[PDB]
Design a protein around this ligand. Structure first.
Ligand SMILES: Nc1nc(Cl)nc2c1ncn2[C@@H]1O[C@@H]2CO[P@](=O)(S)O[C@H]2[C@H]1O
Length: 153
């Protein structure tokens, strides 16, 4: 039972965040304690229509979850993924310690929650492997479209 995870001061933030984390597919699968710790450390920010969230080729230190809005990822001007509420992105640079492999732009008013590298390494350590084999699905799209894949391998 979870009464223990929602009793203290931190409980308000813990609770708005938990329904949300419950629909981010790869972390909906973390168990509750681990997921409550993520909720504790999330921060919020917003992007306007047209703003760049991630610029391809830059160093990246931030992991994102989209909680509202529409954003789109492209690489060498090819659309490789559309994002909506519940999606996460920006993990690959944190896992591989390489520059951002793609650009992500807001397509309307977007609200996100995020973790920095130290928080991502600390809290999401238990699942770096599961996150990592999602990357194979990234290869397919890179290949589907004839784009460079050395950013992954
Ligand atoms: N087909 C895809 N290939 C790749 Cl390498 N990254 C993809 C793909 N689709 C989305 N992304 C995401 O765009 C982000 C760009 O900053 P990262 O740290 S490299 O993380 C990246 C991924 O989360």
């Amino acid at each position: 039972h979870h009464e223990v995870l929602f009793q203290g001061p931190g409980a308000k933030k813990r609770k708005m965040y938990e329904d949300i984390l419950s629909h981010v597919n790869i972390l909906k699968d973390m168990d509750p304690y681990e997921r409550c710790k993520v909720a504790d450390c999330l921060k919020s920010k917003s992007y306007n229509d047209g703003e760049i969230i991630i610029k391809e080729g830059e160093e990246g230190d931030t992991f994102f979850i989209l909680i509202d809005g529409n954003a789109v990822a492209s690489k060498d001007n090819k659309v490789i993924k559309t994002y909506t509420k519940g999606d996460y992105f920006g993990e690959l640079a944190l896992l591989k310690n390489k520059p951002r492999a793609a650009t992500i732009k807001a397509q309307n008013f977007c609200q996100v929650v995020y973790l920095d590298r130290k928080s991502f390494k600390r809290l999401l350590g238990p699942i770096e492997d599961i996150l990592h084999r999602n990357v194979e699905n990234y290869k397919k799209v890179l290949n589907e479209l004839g784009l460079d894949t050395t950013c992954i391998d």
